[PDB]
Amino acid sequence: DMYIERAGDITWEKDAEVTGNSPRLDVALDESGDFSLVE
Amino acid sequence: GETTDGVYRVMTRRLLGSTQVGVGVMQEGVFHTMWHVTKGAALRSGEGRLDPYWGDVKQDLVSYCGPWKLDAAWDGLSEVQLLAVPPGERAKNIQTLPGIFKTKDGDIGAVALDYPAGTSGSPILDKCGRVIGLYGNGVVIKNGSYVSAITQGKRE
Numbered sequence A: 001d002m003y004i005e006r007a008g009d010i011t012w013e014k015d016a017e018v019t020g021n022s023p024r025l026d027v028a029l030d031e032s033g034d035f036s037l038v039e
Numbered sequence B: 001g002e003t004t005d006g007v008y009r010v011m012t013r014r015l016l017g018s019t020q021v022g023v024g025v026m027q028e029g030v031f032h033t034m035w036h037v038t039k040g041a042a043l044r045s046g047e048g049r050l051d052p053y054w055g056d057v058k059q060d061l062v063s064y065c066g067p068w069k070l071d072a073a074w075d076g077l078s079e080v081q082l083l084a085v086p087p088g089e090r091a092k093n094i095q096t097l098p099g100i101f102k103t104k105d106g107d108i109g110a111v112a113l114d115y116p117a118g119t120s121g122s123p124i125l126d127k128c129g130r131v132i133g134l135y136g137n138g139v140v141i142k143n144g145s146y147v148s149a150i151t152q153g154k155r156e
């Protein structure tokens, strides 16, 4: 049995930690909603 | 039940202790999350009950109490923020420039950020604070790192 608990407001944070790269990937989506890589 | 707009943790007491299985967004009286977090099961908010209204396994999205309300889209150029809500940890904003998932049916924004599975459903936002999609459905690329699509629904 699942329940929800508030965790905060949805706001943009100025001076947030900036990380992560921008990969351009060739992907496929199946009927089950699963993403996979194409080669 | 609590219906204030904002980000919420999706918890369960079925397993050992209380476990966080995912995250969602409450907007305009509708709770938005990923299908794989709840599997379309009913939700509790205090003494109130939330019933699924719309859902789709292929999109990996579900809405409770009403139709999908989030319609903002990534502009394809600007940095975004993942409002990460990790299990047992405080909400935190992480800024990043999204990459692209190229599919046979068009391109989708993607964020290369690594978090525990129970962070699925955390919103991804634009500079105006609008939810452009949810984090949690993606792929593991060469090296073992995770890349999530920026999954957005359709507002009818």
Ligand SMILES: NS(=O)(=O)c1ccc2ncsc2c1
Residues within 6 Å of the ligand: B036, B114, B115, B116, B117, B118, B119, B120, B135, B136, B137, B138, B146
């Ligand atoms: N089961 S799943 O493929 O949707 C999944 C797996 C790892 C993970 N890491 C961060 S969010 C997330 C979701």
